[PDB]
Amino acid sequence: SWSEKAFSASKLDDAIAAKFGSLPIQESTAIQIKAPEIAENGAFVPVTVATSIPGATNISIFTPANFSPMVASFDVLPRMKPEVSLRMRMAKTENLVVVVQAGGKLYRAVREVKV
Amino acid sequence: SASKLDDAIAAKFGSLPIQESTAIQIKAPEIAENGAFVPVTVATSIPGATNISIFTPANFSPMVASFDVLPRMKPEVSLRMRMAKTENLVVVVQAGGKLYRAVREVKVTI
Amino acid sequence: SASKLDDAIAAKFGSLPIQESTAIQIKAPEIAENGAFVPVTVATSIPGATNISIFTPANFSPMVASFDVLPRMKPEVSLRMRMAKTENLVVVVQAGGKLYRAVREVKVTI
Amino acid sequence: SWSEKAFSASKLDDAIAAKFGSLPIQESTAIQIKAPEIAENGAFVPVTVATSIPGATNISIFTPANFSPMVASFDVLPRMKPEVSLRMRMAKTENLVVVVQAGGKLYRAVREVKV
């Protein structure tokens, strides 16, 4: 498990690098993720992501456990109060990782969904 | 007008068959005030949708948003568009190697 | 890449002959820092130019600026572009029923 | 002359309406116009226009005397510190009128160039 967490952390960093490049990243409370705290085994979990970060031009959603870690990417003109919804099947307890690009900077937020 | 829209669509998606579809929902006010921020929501129930894109052919930037998704996620996008003039919102969904489209007009008043 | 650029050009100008031209000047740094605002200046000496347009095919909005002018005004445009990655600036001038183009790359560093 | 000024004022308002529509307009000091105060008869006058207005997506330049009053229009993505230069022949003493569109609002500035 600890080993698994280290490997899935490794996957995530590479996938972010693959998408945005080697951009400095920070944690932000200006990213809102709403999902159920717990959900049923193998069920469709509604997830909603928003950000109030002004120059946000991309919202990308990563699930580091799954075989392909990037699950969705949203390009938008800035200053449009974007909010994005999707439903994802979830077979095991996993962290959703949201990365927002604004300016030349990445902002990160994470939320766990126990299954 | 149609030429410009098709060019924007082609640059995003390439040369794919496009057809109209009622399986794309666009929620917006029928009419809006000049300068007001308009809530817009777009959704689709098309099963193997891997993209949903929003175009405003009347504007300088004809593509407003693009949502790359995995199949079966039933994507929905919501945003606030400031409206200067009457506008058509064009939504295109890619599923397999087909395009699906819906159009909605938002009238603007003085 | 070229397909996308051509589509953007076609949506602005229609179906006109395009040719490369050294009568379009692009001033930009050879290399830039990631996240830095880059000064960019574009000019042309083409006499009957009625438009000069700036494209960045690598970006979400492939058209950055468009300057409609009367002939003989020798338009020049200047702006600051933030750079996230290496980029090609494509400049297109319309004169009569012909298009004229120049390209310049701006490298970006870590 | 007074009559002329009234008619050229009339032309200008119609041309602005033609371009932007019936949008409320105000005067702004956040529009910079640099041109010679005086210039020689029938000569090419270099003119530079900038604006520091944040959401500026269009700069249009009007010369209300001339037969076609709109002389140039500049569309741009916002937040790019645009500055636009041109050279115009000038046969009589005339006002340059710059209108900037940002948001749903027009901002106006004027400068006279004596010939």
CSV table of C-alpha atoms in Angstrom, one decimal:
chain,number,residue,atom,x,y,z
A,1,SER,CA,0.0,0.0,0.0
A,2,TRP,CA,2.7,2.5,1.0
A,3,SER,CA,4.6,1.1,-2.0
A,4,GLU,CA,1.5,1.6,-4.2
A,5,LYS,CA,0.9,5.1,-3.0
A,6,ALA,CA,4.6,5.9,-3.9
A,7,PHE,CA,4.1,4.5,-7.4
A,8,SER,CA,0.7,6.1,-8.1
A,9,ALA,CA,2.3,9.4,-6.9
A,10,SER,CA,5.0,8.8,-9.4
A,11,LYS,CA,2.5,8.2,-12.2
A,12,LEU,CA,0.7,11.5,-11.4
A,13,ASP,CA,3.7,13.7,-11.5
A,14,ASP,CA,4.7,12.3,-14.9
A,15,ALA,CA,1.2,12.7,-16.3
A,16,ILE,CA,1.2,16.4,-15.1
A,17,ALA,CA,4.6,16.9,-16.7
A,18,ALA,CA,3.2,15.2,-19.9
A,19,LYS,CA,0.3,17.7,-20.1
A,20,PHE,CA,1.6,21.0,-18.9
A,21,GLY,CA,5.4,20.6,-18.9
A,22,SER,CA,7.7,21.3,-16.0
A,23,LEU,CA,5.7,24.1,-14.4
A,24,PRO,CA,5.9,25.1,-10.8
A,25,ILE,CA,2.9,23.9,-8.9
A,26,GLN,CA,1.3,25.0,-5.7
A,27,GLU,CA,-1.7,23.9,-3.6
A,28,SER,CA,-4.8,26.2,-3.8
A,29,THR,CA,-8.0,26.5,-1.8
A,30,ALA,CA,-9.5,28.4,-4.8
A,31,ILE,CA,-10.5,25.1,-6.4
A,32,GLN,CA,-13.8,23.6,-5.4
A,33,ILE,CA,-14.4,19.8,-5.8
A,34,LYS,CA,-17.7,18.4,-4.8
A,35,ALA,CA,-18.1,14.7,-4.7
A,36,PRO,CA,-19.7,12.2,-2.3
A,37,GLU,CA,-17.5,11.4,0.7
A,38,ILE,CA,-18.4,7.7,0.4
A,39,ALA,CA,-20.0,5.9,-2.6
A,40,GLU,CA,-21.1,2.3,-3.4
A,41,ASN,CA,-18.8,-0.3,-4.9
A,42,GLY,CA,-18.4,0.1,-8.7
A,43,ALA,CA,-21.0,2.9,-8.9
A,44,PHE,CA,-21.2,6.1,-11.0
A,45,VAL,CA,-20.0,9.0,-8.8
A,46,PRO,CA,-21.1,12.5,-9.8
A,47,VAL,CA,-18.2,14.9,-9.5
A,48,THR,CA,-18.2,18.7,-9.9
A,49,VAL,CA,-15.2,20.9,-10.3
A,50,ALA,CA,-15.0,24.7,-10.2
A,51,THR,CA,-12.3,27.4,-9.7
A,52,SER,CA,-12.4,31.0,-8.9
A,53,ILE,CA,-8.8,31.6,-10.1
A,54,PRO,CA,-9.1,34.6,-12.5
A,55,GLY,CA,-6.9,33.6,-15.5
A,56,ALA,CA,-7.9,29.9,-15.5
A,57,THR,CA,-7.6,28.6,-19.0
A,58,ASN,CA,-7.4,24.9,-18.3
A,59,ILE,CA,-8.8,22.5,-15.7
A,60,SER,CA,-7.5,18.9,-15.9
A,61,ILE,CA,-8.7,16.0,-13.8
A,62,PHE,CA,-6.4,13.1,-12.8
A,63,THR,CA,-7.0,9.8,-11.1
A,64,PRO,CA,-3.6,8.5,-10.3
A,65,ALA,CA,-4.7,4.9,-9.6
A,66,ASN,CA,-6.3,4.2,-13.0
A,67,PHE,CA,-4.3,2.9,-16.0
A,68,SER,CA,-4.6,6.2,-17.8
A,69,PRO,CA,-4.3,8.9,-15.1
A,70,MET,CA,-5.7,11.9,-16.9
A,71,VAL,CA,-9.5,11.5,-17.1
A,72,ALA,CA,-10.6,14.9,-18.4
A,73,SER,CA,-9.2,18.2,-19.6
A,74,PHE,CA,-11.1,21.4,-20.0
A,75,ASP,CA,-9.8,24.3,-22.1
A,76,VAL,CA,-11.7,27.6,-21.8
A,77,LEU,CA,-11.3,31.3,-22.4
A,78,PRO,CA,-10.5,33.1,-19.1
A,79,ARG,CA,-13.0,34.9,-16.9
A,80,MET,CA,-16.0,32.7,-17.6
A,81,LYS,CA,-16.6,31.1,-14.1
A,82,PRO,CA,-16.3,27.6,-15.5
A,83,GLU,CA,-17.8,24.7,-13.7
A,84,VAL,CA,-17.5,21.2,-15.1
A,85,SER,CA,-19.5,18.0,-14.2
A,86,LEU,CA,-18.9,14.4,-15.0
A,87,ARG,CA,-19.8,10.9,-13.6
A,88,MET,CA,-17.1,8.3,-13.1
A,89,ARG,CA,-17.3,4.6,-12.2
A,90,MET,CA,-15.1,3.9,-9.2
A,91,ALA,CA,-13.9,0.4,-8.3
A,92,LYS,CA,-11.5,1.3,-5.5
A,93,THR,CA,-11.0,4.1,-3.0
A,94,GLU,CA,-9.1,6.8,-4.9
A,95,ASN,CA,-7.9,10.4,-4.9
A,96,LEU,CA,-9.2,12.9,-7.5
A,97,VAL,CA,-6.5,15.4,-8.4
A,98,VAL,CA,-7.5,18.7,-10.1
A,99,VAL,CA,-4.8,20.9,-11.7
A,100,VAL,CA,-5.6,24.4,-12.9
A,101,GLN,CA,-3.5,26.4,-15.3
A,102,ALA,CA,-3.6,30.2,-15.1
A,103,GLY,CA,-0.8,32.5,-16.2
A,104,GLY,CA,2.4,30.4,-16.2
A,105,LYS,CA,1.4,28.6,-13.0
A,106,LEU,CA,-0.3,25.4,-11.9
A,107,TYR,CA,-2.6,25.2,-9.0
A,108,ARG,CA,-3.5,21.9,-7.4
A,109,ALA,CA,-6.3,20.4,-5.2
A,110,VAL,CA,-7.1,16.9,-4.2
A,111,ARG,CA,-10.1,15.1,-2.7
A,112,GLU,CA,-10.4,11.5,-1.7
A,113,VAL,CA,-13.5,9.5,-2.4
A,114,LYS,CA,-13.8,6.3,-0.3
A,115,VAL,CA,-15.6,3.5,-2.0
B,1,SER,CA,-20.9,32.8,-41.5
B,2,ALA,CA,-21.5,29.1,-42.1
B,3,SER,CA,-18.1,29.0,-43.9
B,4,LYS,CA,-16.4,30.5,-40.8
B,5,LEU,CA,-18.2,28.1,-38.4
B,6,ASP,CA,-17.2,25.1,-40.5
B,7,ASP,CA,-13.6,26.3,-40.6
B,8,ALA,CA,-13.5,26.5,-36.8
B,9,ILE,CA,-15.1,23.1,-36.5
B,10,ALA,CA,-12.6,21.6,-39.0
B,11,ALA,CA,-9.6,23.0,-37.1
B,12,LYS,CA,-10.8,21.4,-33.9
B,13,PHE,CA,-12.1,18.0,-35.2
B,14,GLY,CA,-10.9,17.6,-38.8
B,15,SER,CA,-13.0,16.2,-41.6
B,16,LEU,CA,-15.8,14.3,-39.8
B,17,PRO,CA,-19.4,13.8,-40.7
B,18,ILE,CA,-21.5,16.3,-38.7
B,19,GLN,CA,-25.3,15.8,-38.0
B,20,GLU,CA,-27.8,17.7,-35.9
B,21,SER,CA,-28.8,16.0,-32.7
B,22,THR,CA,-31.4,16.5,-29.9
B,23,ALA,CA,-29.2,14.4,-27.5
B,24,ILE,CA,-27.3,17.7,-26.7
B,25,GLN,CA,-28.9,20.1,-24.2
B,26,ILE,CA,-28.3,23.8,-24.1
B,27,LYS,CA,-29.7,25.8,-21.2
B,28,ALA,CA,-29.6,29.6,-21.6
B,29,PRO,CA,-32.1,32.4,-21.3
B,30,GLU,CA,-34.2,33.1,-24.3
B,31,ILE,CA,-33.4,36.8,-24.0
B,32,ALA,CA,-30.7,38.7,-22.2
B,33,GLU,CA,-29.8,42.3,-21.3
B,34,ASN,CA,-27.0,44.0,-23.1
B,35,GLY,CA,-23.8,43.6,-21.0
B,36,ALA,CA,-25.2,41.0,-18.7
B,37,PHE,CA,-23.4,37.8,-17.8
B,38,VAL,CA,-25.6,35.0,-19.1
B,39,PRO,CA,-25.6,31.6,-17.4
B,40,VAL,CA,-25.1,28.8,-20.0
B,41,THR,CA,-25.1,25.1,-19.4
B,42,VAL,CA,-24.5,22.4,-22.0
B,43,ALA,CA,-24.8,18.6,-21.5
B,44,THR,CA,-25.1,15.5,-23.6
B,45,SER,CA,-26.4,12.0,-23.2
B,46,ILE,CA,-24.5,10.6,-26.2
B,47,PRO,CA,-22.7,7.5,-24.7
B,48,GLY,CA,-19.3,7.5,-26.3
B,49,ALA,CA,-18.8,11.3,-26.3
B,50,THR,CA,-15.1,12.1,-25.9
B,51,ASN,CA,-15.4,15.9,-26.5
B,52,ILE,CA,-17.9,18.6,-26.1
B,53,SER,CA,-17.0,22.0,-27.6
B,54,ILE,CA,-18.8,25.3,-27.6
B,55,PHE,CA,-18.6,27.8,-30.5
B,56,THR,CA,-19.8,31.4,-30.9
B,57,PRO,CA,-19.3,32.1,-34.6
B,58,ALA,CA,-20.3,35.8,-34.2
B,59,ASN,CA,-17.2,36.5,-32.0
B,60,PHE,CA,-13.5,37.2,-32.4
B,61,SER,CA,-12.7,33.9,-30.8
B,62,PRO,CA,-15.2,31.4,-32.3
B,63,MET,CA,-14.4,28.7,-29.9
B,64,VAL,CA,-15.2,29.4,-26.2
B,65,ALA,CA,-14.5,26.0,-24.5
B,66,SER,CA,-13.5,22.4,-25.2
B,67,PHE,CA,-14.0,19.5,-22.8
B,68,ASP,CA,-12.1,16.3,-23.5
B,69,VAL,CA,-13.6,13.4,-21.6
B,70,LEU,CA,-13.6,9.6,-21.5
B,71,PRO,CA,-16.7,7.8,-22.7
B,72,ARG,CA,-19.7,7.2,-20.4
B,73,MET,CA,-19.0,10.3,-18.2
B,74,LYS,CA,-22.0,12.3,-19.4
B,75,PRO,CA,-20.1,15.6,-19.3
B,76,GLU,CA,-21.8,18.9,-18.4
B,77,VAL,CA,-20.3,22.3,-18.7
B,78,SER,CA,-21.5,25.5,-17.1
B,79,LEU,CA,-20.3,29.1,-17.6
B,80,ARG,CA,-21.2,32.7,-17.6
B,81,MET,CA,-21.0,34.5,-21.0
B,82,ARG,CA,-21.2,38.3,-21.2
B,83,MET,CA,-23.4,39.2,-24.1
B,84,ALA,CA,-22.9,42.3,-26.3
B,85,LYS,CA,-25.3,41.3,-29.1
B,86,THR,CA,-27.7,38.6,-30.2
B,87,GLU,CA,-25.8,35.3,-30.5
B,88,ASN,CA,-25.9,31.7,-31.6
B,89,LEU,CA,-24.3,29.1,-29.4
B,90,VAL,CA,-23.2,26.1,-31.3
B,91,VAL,CA,-22.4,22.9,-29.5
B,92,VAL,CA,-20.4,20.1,-31.1
B,93,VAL,CA,-20.0,16.6,-29.6
B,94,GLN,CA,-17.5,14.0,-31.0
B,95,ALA,CA,-18.5,10.4,-30.5
B,96,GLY,CA,-16.6,7.7,-32.3
B,97,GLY,CA,-15.7,9.2,-35.7
B,98,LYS,CA,-19.0,11.3,-35.9
B,99,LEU,CA,-19.9,14.8,-35.0
B,100,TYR,CA,-23.2,15.8,-33.5
B,101,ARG,CA,-24.5,19.4,-33.3
B,102,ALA,CA,-27.1,21.6,-31.6
B,103,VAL,CA,-27.7,25.3,-32.0
B,104,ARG,CA,-29.4,27.8,-29.7
B,105,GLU,CA,-29.9,31.6,-30.1
B,106,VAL,CA,-29.8,34.1,-27.2
B,107,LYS,CA,-31.5,37.4,-28.1
B,108,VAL,CA,-30.0,40.5,-26.5
B,109,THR,CA,-31.9,43.7,-25.7
B,110,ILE,CA,-31.1,47.4,-25.4
C,1,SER,CA,-0.8,21.8,-37.3
C,2,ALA,CA,-0.7,23.2,-40.9
C,3,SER,CA,-4.3,22.0,-41.4
C,4,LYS,CA,-5.4,23.9,-38.2
C,5,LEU,CA,-3.5,27.1,-39.2
C,6,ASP,CA,-5.0,27.0,-42.7
C,7,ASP,CA,-8.4,26.6,-41.3
C,8,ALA,CA,-7.9,29.7,-39.0
C,9,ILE,CA,-6.6,31.7,-42.0
C,10,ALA,CA,-9.5,30.6,-44.2
C,11,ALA,CA,-12.1,31.6,-41.5
C,12,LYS,CA,-10.7,35.1,-41.4
C,13,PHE,CA,-9.8,35.7,-45.1
C,14,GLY,CA,-11.6,33.1,-47.2
C,15,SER,CA,-9.9,31.3,-50.1
C,16,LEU,CA,-7.2,33.6,-51.2
C,17,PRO,CA,-3.7,32.9,-52.6
C,18,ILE,CA,-1.1,33.0,-49.8
C,19,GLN,CA,2.6,33.5,-50.4
C,20,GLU,CA,5.6,34.1,-48.1
C,21,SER,CA,6.9,37.6,-47.9
C,22,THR,CA,9.9,39.4,-46.4
C,23,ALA,CA,7.9,42.7,-46.5
C,24,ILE,CA,6.4,41.8,-43.1
C,25,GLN,CA,8.5,42.5,-40.0
C,26,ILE,CA,8.3,40.6,-36.7
C,27,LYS,CA,10.2,41.8,-33.7
C,28,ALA,CA,10.4,39.4,-30.8
C,29,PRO,CA,13.1,38.0,-28.6
C,30,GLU,CA,14.8,34.9,-30.0
C,31,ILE,CA,14.3,33.2,-26.6
C,32,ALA,CA,12.1,33.9,-23.6
C,33,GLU,CA,11.6,32.8,-20.0
C,34,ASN,CA,8.7,30.5,-19.1
C,35,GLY,CA,5.8,32.7,-17.9
C,36,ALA,CA,7.4,36.0,-19.0
C,37,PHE,CA,5.5,38.6,-21.0
C,38,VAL,CA,7.2,38.9,-24.3
C,39,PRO,CA,7.1,42.2,-26.3
C,40,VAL,CA,6.0,41.5,-29.9
C,41,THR,CA,5.9,44.1,-32.7
C,42,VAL,CA,4.7,43.4,-36.2
C,43,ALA,CA,4.8,45.8,-39.2
C,44,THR,CA,4.5,45.8,-42.9
C,45,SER,CA,5.6,47.9,-45.8
C,46,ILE,CA,3.1,46.3,-48.3
C,47,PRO,CA,1.4,49.3,-49.9
C,48,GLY,CA,-2.3,48.3,-50.2
C,49,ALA,CA,-2.5,46.3,-47.0
C,50,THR,CA,-6.0,46.5,-45.5
C,51,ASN,CA,-5.4,43.9,-42.8
C,52,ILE,CA,-2.7,42.5,-40.7
C,53,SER,CA,-3.5,39.5,-38.5
C,54,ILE,CA,-1.5,37.6,-35.9
C,55,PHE,CA,-1.9,33.8,-35.4
C,56,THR,CA,-0.5,31.5,-32.7
C,57,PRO,CA,-1.5,28.0,-34.1
C,58,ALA,CA,-0.2,26.3,-30.9
C,59,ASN,CA,-2.8,28.0,-28.7
C,60,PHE,CA,-6.5,27.5,-27.8
C,61,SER,CA,-7.3,30.8,-29.6
C,62,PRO,CA,-5.3,30.6,-32.8
C,63,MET,CA,-6.0,34.2,-33.7
C,64,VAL,CA,-4.5,36.8,-31.3
C,65,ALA,CA,-5.2,40.1,-33.1
C,66,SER,CA,-6.6,41.6,-36.3
C,67,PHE,CA,-6.0,45.1,-37.6
C,68,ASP,CA,-8.3,46.5,-40.3
C,69,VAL,CA,-6.7,49.5,-41.9
C,70,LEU,CA,-7.0,51.7,-45.1
C,71,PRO,CA,-4.3,51.4,-47.7
C,72,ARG,CA,-1.0,53.4,-47.4
C,73,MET,CA,-1.2,53.6,-43.5
C,74,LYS,CA,1.8,51.3,-42.9
C,75,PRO,CA,0.2,49.7,-39.9
C,76,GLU,CA,2.3,48.5,-36.9
C,77,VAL,CA,1.0,46.5,-33.9
C,78,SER,CA,2.7,46.0,-30.6
C,79,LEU,CA,1.7,43.8,-27.7
C,80,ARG,CA,2.9,41.7,-24.8
C,81,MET,CA,2.3,38.0,-25.0
C,82,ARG,CA,2.9,35.7,-22.0
C,83,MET,CA,4.7,32.6,-23.2
C,84,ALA,CA,4.1,29.1,-21.7
C,85,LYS,CA,5.9,27.1,-24.3
C,86,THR,CA,7.9,27.5,-27.5
C,87,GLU,CA,5.7,29.2,-30.1
C,88,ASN,CA,5.4,30.2,-33.8
C,89,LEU,CA,4.0,33.6,-34.5
C,90,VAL,CA,2.3,33.7,-37.9
C,91,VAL,CA,1.5,37.0,-39.5
C,92,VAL,CA,-0.8,37.4,-42.4
C,93,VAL,CA,-1.3,40.6,-44.4
C,94,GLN,CA,-4.2,41.0,-47.0
C,95,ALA,CA,-3.4,43.3,-49.9
C,96,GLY,CA,-5.8,43.4,-52.8
C,97,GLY,CA,-7.0,39.8,-53.2
C,98,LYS,CA,-3.7,38.3,-52.1
C,99,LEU,CA,-2.4,37.0,-48.8
C,100,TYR,CA,1.2,37.5,-47.6
C,101,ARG,CA,2.8,35.6,-44.7
C,102,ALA,CA,5.8,35.6,-42.4
C,103,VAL,CA,6.6,33.2,-39.5
C,104,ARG,CA,8.8,33.6,-36.5
C,105,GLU,CA,9.6,31.2,-33.7
C,106,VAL,CA,10.1,32.3,-30.0
C,107,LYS,CA,11.9,29.6,-27.9
C,108,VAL,CA,10.9,29.3,-24.3
C,109,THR,CA,13.2,28.1,-21.5
C,110,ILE,CA,12.7,26.5,-18.1
D,1,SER,CA,-18.1,75.9,-39.7
D,2,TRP,CA,-20.4,75.6,-36.7
D,3,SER,CA,-22.8,73.9,-39.2
D,4,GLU,CA,-20.0,71.7,-40.4
D,5,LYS,CA,-19.0,70.7,-36.9
D,6,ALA,CA,-22.6,69.8,-36.2
D,7,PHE,CA,-22.8,67.6,-39.3
D,8,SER,CA,-19.5,65.9,-38.8
D,9,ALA,CA,-20.6,65.2,-35.1
D,10,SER,CA,-23.7,63.7,-36.6
D,11,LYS,CA,-21.7,61.4,-39.0
D,12,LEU,CA,-19.5,60.2,-36.1
D,13,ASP,CA,-22.3,59.1,-33.8
D,14,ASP,CA,-23.9,57.1,-36.7
D,15,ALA,CA,-20.6,55.5,-37.5
D,16,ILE,CA,-20.1,54.4,-33.9
D,17,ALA,CA,-23.6,53.1,-33.8
D,18,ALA,CA,-22.9,51.3,-37.1
D,19,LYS,CA,-19.9,49.6,-35.6
D,20,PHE,CA,-20.7,48.8,-31.9
D,21,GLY,CA,-24.5,49.4,-31.8
D,22,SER,CA,-26.3,51.6,-29.3
D,23,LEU,CA,-23.9,51.2,-26.4
D,24,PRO,CA,-23.4,53.7,-23.6
D,25,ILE,CA,-20.3,55.7,-24.1
D,26,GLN,CA,-18.1,57.7,-21.7
D,27,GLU,CA,-15.0,59.7,-21.9
D,28,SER,CA,-11.8,58.1,-20.5
D,29,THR,CA,-8.3,59.4,-19.7
D,30,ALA,CA,-7.2,55.7,-19.9
D,31,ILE,CA,-6.7,56.0,-23.7
D,32,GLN,CA,-3.4,57.5,-24.9
D,33,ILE,CA,-3.2,59.1,-28.3
D,34,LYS,CA,0.2,60.4,-29.5
D,35,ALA,CA,0.3,62.5,-32.6
D,36,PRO,CA,2.0,65.8,-33.6
D,37,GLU,CA,0.2,68.9,-32.3
D,38,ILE,CA,0.8,70.6,-35.7
D,39,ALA,CA,1.8,68.9,-39.1
D,40,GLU,CA,2.5,70.1,-42.7
D,41,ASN,CA,-0.2,70.4,-45.3
D,42,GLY,CA,-1.2,67.1,-46.9
D,43,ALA,CA,1.6,65.2,-45.1
D,44,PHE,CA,1.8,61.7,-43.6
D,45,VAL,CA,1.1,62.1,-39.8
D,46,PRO,CA,2.3,59.2,-37.5
D,47,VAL,CA,-0.3,58.4,-34.9
D,48,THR,CA,0.0,56.0,-32.0
D,49,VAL,CA,-2.9,54.8,-29.9
D,50,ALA,CA,-2.8,52.7,-26.7
D,51,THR,CA,-5.2,51.9,-23.8
D,52,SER,CA,-4.6,50.6,-20.3
D,53,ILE,CA,-8.3,49.6,-20.0
D,54,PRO,CA,-8.2,45.9,-18.8
D,55,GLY,CA,-10.8,44.1,-20.9
D,56,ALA,CA,-10.2,46.1,-24.1
D,57,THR,CA,-11.0,43.9,-27.1
D,58,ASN,CA,-11.5,46.5,-29.7
D,59,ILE,CA,-9.8,49.8,-30.6
D,60,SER,CA,-11.5,51.7,-33.4
D,61,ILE,CA,-10.2,55.0,-34.9
D,62,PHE,CA,-12.6,57.6,-36.4
D,63,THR,CA,-11.9,60.7,-38.5
D,64,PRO,CA,-15.3,62.4,-38.7
D,65,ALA,CA,-14.4,64.9,-41.4
D,66,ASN,CA,-13.4,62.3,-44.0
D,67,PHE,CA,-15.9,60.6,-46.4
D,68,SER,CA,-15.6,57.2,-44.6
D,69,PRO,CA,-15.3,58.1,-41.0
D,70,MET,CA,-14.0,54.9,-39.6
D,71,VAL,CA,-10.3,54.7,-40.6
D,72,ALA,CA,-9.1,51.6,-38.6
D,73,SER,CA,-10.3,48.9,-36.3
D,74,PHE,CA,-8.3,46.6,-34.0
D,75,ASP,CA,-9.6,43.4,-32.6
D,76,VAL,CA,-7.5,41.7,-29.9
D,77,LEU,CA,-7.7,39.2,-27.1
D,78,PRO,CA,-7.9,41.1,-23.8
D,79,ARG,CA,-4.9,41.8,-21.4
D,80,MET,CA,-2.2,42.2,-24.1
D,81,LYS,CA,-1.2,45.8,-23.6
D,82,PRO,CA,-2.0,46.6,-27.3
D,83,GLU,CA,-0.5,49.6,-29.0
D,84,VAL,CA,-1.3,50.3,-32.6
D,85,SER,CA,0.5,52.7,-35.0
D,86,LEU,CA,-0.4,54.1,-38.4
D,87,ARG,CA,0.4,57.0,-40.7
D,88,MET,CA,-2.4,59.1,-42.2
D,89,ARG,CA,-2.4,61.8,-44.8
D,90,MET,CA,-4.2,64.9,-43.5
D,91,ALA,CA,-5.5,67.6,-45.8
D,92,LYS,CA,-7.4,69.7,-43.2
D,93,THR,CA,-7.4,70.3,-39.5
D,94,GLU,CA,-9.3,67.4,-38.0
D,95,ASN,CA,-10.1,65.5,-34.8
D,96,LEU,CA,-9.1,61.9,-34.3
D,97,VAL,CA,-11.6,60.0,-32.2
D,98,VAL,CA,-10.7,56.7,-30.5
D,99,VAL,CA,-13.3,54.4,-29.2
D,100,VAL,CA,-12.4,51.4,-27.0
D,101,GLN,CA,-14.8,48.5,-26.3
D,102,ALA,CA,-14.3,46.6,-23.0
D,103,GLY,CA,-17.1,44.6,-21.3
D,104,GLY,CA,-20.4,46.0,-22.6
D,105,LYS,CA,-19.1,49.6,-22.5
D,106,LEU,CA,-17.5,52.1,-24.9
D,107,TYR,CA,-14.8,54.5,-23.8
D,108,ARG,CA,-13.9,57.6,-25.9
D,109,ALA,CA,-11.0,59.9,-26.3
D,110,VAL,CA,-10.3,62.7,-28.8
D,111,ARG,CA,-7.3,64.6,-30.0
D,112,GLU,CA,-7.1,67.4,-32.5
D,113,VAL,CA,-4.3,67.6,-35.1
D,114,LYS,CA,-4.0,71.1,-36.6
D,115,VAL,CA,-2.6,71.1,-40.1
